[PDB]
What does this fold into?
Amino acid sequence: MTPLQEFWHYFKRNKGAVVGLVYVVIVLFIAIFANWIAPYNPAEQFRDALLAPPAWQEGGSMAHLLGTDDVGRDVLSRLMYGARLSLLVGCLVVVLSLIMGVILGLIAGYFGGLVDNIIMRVVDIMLALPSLLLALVLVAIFGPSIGNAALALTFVALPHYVRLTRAAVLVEVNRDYVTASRVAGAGAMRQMFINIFPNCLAPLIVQASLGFSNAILDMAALGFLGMGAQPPTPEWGTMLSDVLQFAQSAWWVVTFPGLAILLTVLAFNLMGDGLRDALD
Amino acid sequence: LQFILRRLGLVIPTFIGITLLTFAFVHMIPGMWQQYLHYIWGVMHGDLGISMKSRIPVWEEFVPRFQATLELGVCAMIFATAVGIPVGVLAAVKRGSIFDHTAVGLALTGYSMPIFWWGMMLIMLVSVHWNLTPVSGRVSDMVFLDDSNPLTGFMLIDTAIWGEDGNFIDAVAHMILPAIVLGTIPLAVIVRMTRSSMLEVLGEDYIRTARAKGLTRMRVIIVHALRNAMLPVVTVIGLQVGTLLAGAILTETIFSWPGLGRWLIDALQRRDYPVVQGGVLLVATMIILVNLLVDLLYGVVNPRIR
Amino acid sequence: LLNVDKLSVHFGDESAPFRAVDRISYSVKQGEVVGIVGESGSGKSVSSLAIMGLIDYPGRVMAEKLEFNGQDLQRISEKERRNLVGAEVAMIFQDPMTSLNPCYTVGFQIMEAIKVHQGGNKSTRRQRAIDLLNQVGIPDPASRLDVYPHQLSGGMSQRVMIAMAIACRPKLLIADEPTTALDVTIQAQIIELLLELQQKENMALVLITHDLALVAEAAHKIIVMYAGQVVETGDAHAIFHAPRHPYTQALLRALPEFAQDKERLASLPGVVPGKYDRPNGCLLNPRCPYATDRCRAEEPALNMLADGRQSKCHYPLDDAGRP
Amino acid sequence: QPLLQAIDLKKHYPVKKGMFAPERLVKALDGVSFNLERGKTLAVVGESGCGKSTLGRLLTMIEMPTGGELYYQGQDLLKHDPQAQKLRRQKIQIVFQNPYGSLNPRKKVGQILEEPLLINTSLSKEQRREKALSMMAKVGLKTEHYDRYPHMFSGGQRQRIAIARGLMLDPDVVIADEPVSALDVSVRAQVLNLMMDLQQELGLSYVFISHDLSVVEHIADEVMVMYLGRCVEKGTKDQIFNNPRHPYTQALLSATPRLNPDDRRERIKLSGELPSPLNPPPGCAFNARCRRRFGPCTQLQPQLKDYGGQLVACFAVDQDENPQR
Ligand code: SF4
Ligand code: SF4
It folds into this structure.
């Protein structure tokens, strides 16, 4: 088998991985085509049916399938537009932080010396606080908005990929083939990006899935605490920000947004389990 | 021993850095060489500032809330550790069993779980619908303790030593749900690292040597494998006790608990920057001290370090 | 002492097993030294791990007869297997660095080996450990007990392995490629130590190696293995003067020792059969210089020759090296 | 003029016990010298820690020396100058110990063989392909292997790719760091044959670093024996293998097994483990283990001397030759 073929072959071995993949695909589909598939606009108010139960409970109706929120706004519409923002910010946070983290990690791992010491020192400053507290401090300083949250989450995600890329590169640079290409005369840029990096891939393609899982939980965390996303907008964490008094009166408002976070993050941790399994 | 001098040599640069960063967050973002030495001179005298939402010194607001956070974090870690490690050992010994699958499956669930939402569901099921447990606070509104006694401020110790018969029972009642929700994540993590480390160690040649001596299966697992599989478990444990503050900021607001997380997030929402400026320095100092103690312990348990 | 008949060890799915050991049969007398030799695919070690019970569930062990000291090993209560392993059979393994537990002092690891099979007295067991470390030639036996495995050199670590194996007065000892990780002047000492213990205790010894020259000194009987099968067996002097099978002839003509100065060495063409490419008939048939139609149609029996040797060939080789 | 010449090559690694103590020198190699000739094999033999794997790293410019001189054809090879950097890489090349760790896992075989041409030469794509296929045919790999990854080759075929990679720049000296040690008996033979063939065809010289004296006996033209970073005996293949005179060589040869019963004319025993390079003995490095120890051997370090062509670093051989002492 070719390396791709062999990868997929092993991947299929894991049923959980498969199912997770399926669910991921589904949510992506939802996200992309939200506009068309959603039953109502996510800002619209049906003031005739405030806190209407889901369609299968005795008080509900088939018009509003998962019921309505306090202001008479439709939960299935809000969840599907929330899938859109949750995957959008997930992609942005993972792609920007993985680009910078690979580069700073390759530079720190290959050159050693003062350049290694200074990069790893500044990483250990920003890991001194737990990630969410540093993201909250940054979003407090620069003001709560969806964009400012995403750009705080890139900064606190970055040190984990720097640290793992360095660990992969130090396990790599002492191998004989990196020395063989140095005896043949390869320059520093060639050694890192054309000889070392293809082997550092494997350890990191699992961290992309952990990255999505953490970024969605951190978005949901910022949103629940009233930071980042703001109340008019359909985002799964902010939907749960003011809900606790409904624990007696309306179980759907509290259950469904968190169920959707759970599912999506579970799905991506299933990717990580599968990809890690499939690369050995 | 050269290893603790080595670890202090990495700690000092990071401590220096967080004092410079926390000075920058006090000199800028209000409401230079000579001014840094001054600010530090204030920190070492305990003058961390006076809060804006009420005019109490930040250190006098901190100490009672650090105590209320430590007790909850200790219960969450006892629960995690106690439950976690046995499960992870069992899972690896029973690889491929129903149990094995169950362990992994649950583990995944917990590790992928939004911790704030899980608190609301446990409140809704256990406290609101089935009425088995209390919904909020550290201890019930009808409990108070006689301030003439030398109370510690750890409510679960103080109500064991003093007060009416029923107060202790009520202290625990309030503790179980916060401990279980906070400890979920740690539990999950531990289980995964223990199972992984055990399946690495049960493949090592020294376990083949243990079997070749005729040792009983329980003695190969507990004396030979688990002794070495605990070395990774000590490191992960040290990471968990860093993330308990992020867990606490999310759970502590739901249960209305009088801890440090509710105080920090209220200060961030209210722009009470003196509480944030003092709180960041103390939380960073705590996490550095706990990392240094877990690194020192790792040095005692791993004989390659002596 | 040890009596093996039709031992087979299969790995993987029962529609198409990897036959890592395939219908082998041999016996070890009391006080005998037996060498097992073969190249990397040969299955030599798997035959011995199967006696100990160190094969895990992906592998399956079956035998017509696996008698040890008059005790059947196929249907033995686990308790009794424990009783046997470490006290009548013992084993030395390939890597001397990873074979000792890194977290316990070597005194704990010897005093444990004594505890499971003999008396428990702390003083008595420490005394027995000091006697054992004298017996394997440690420089300062009393101070070495408090030393961790990462502080020992490769040679010192393998002496501690022999001290655990010899602890309870064993009757058979298996050395699975003991010295291949070690320097030449350290190898010579460990093999002399095993042969000195063999002569002093009258115990049997099984050596597994790829180095034909090492068993040429040490062994009384040599067994040669190819592709999981036994292919020649005989007395250790004659087996390398008149080889009765094409594989031992080819394996010797590939040795530098059997060649002049700077002259080309012989070799057989092609790789060892794996799980996918098992030929019909004789397993050496793709490679063998003397092959004929019968060698493809029929699996050769392990024939016994008039001189007392055994060869798994339809045409066993004459005293001049020809069919 | 010698093809490659080394005068007093040495390497001291400075090591630190901890913050509380001075630095000290691990003298991993301490004044080796040789004259490698065109179309000849120089064999470097010794047990682990003797410095043989440092000499391979020095001569291939993987690490720089801390003294002495290395000349190729009368030109200095240890200058920093770019014109010497071309000569270094074109003329001297390496074959490594481990086949599993010396080919890059993610690159195709064609890629691995063309990379040296792409970095050093000006050859075109087609040209590079042509030269890679020609080298694979010379080394014994079929054309259809060109686009395979190294993880789908046997250990013998991996050392074939590693030898093919060395030969690309048309080298004069190929340095072989334990090249046949990981391989089994039929594959060793094969590899050896290939090597001999290439020697005979291209006119290479080998620096053969190994501890398998059996092989050495078969391959070698000139042999050098090392102990704790110094050369202790040097001479012709025949000389050393037929008439060894340093006490360590007598102990090392008699400790190797021999299949033929007549070869092991006497058995000699050392009764102790190797000195650590971190704490060298006071005098001769073999003084702790030597059958022949004598008053001078604790106080002074022996020096190589000619005793009839053979070079022997031993005061007792000196006295056997020189009774006046
Ligand atoms: S049986 Fe036939 S193929 Fe097998 S070794 Fe003998 S001659 Fe060769
Ligand atoms: S110099 Fe002395 S100690 Fe060294 S090898 Fe010669 S006789 Fe032995």
The first helix of chain D runs from residue 52 to 59. DSSP finds ten helices and twelve strands in chain D. Residues C 246, 282, 284-285, 288, 290-291, 295, 300, 313-315 surround iron/sulfur cluster (ligand 1) (CB under 6 Å).
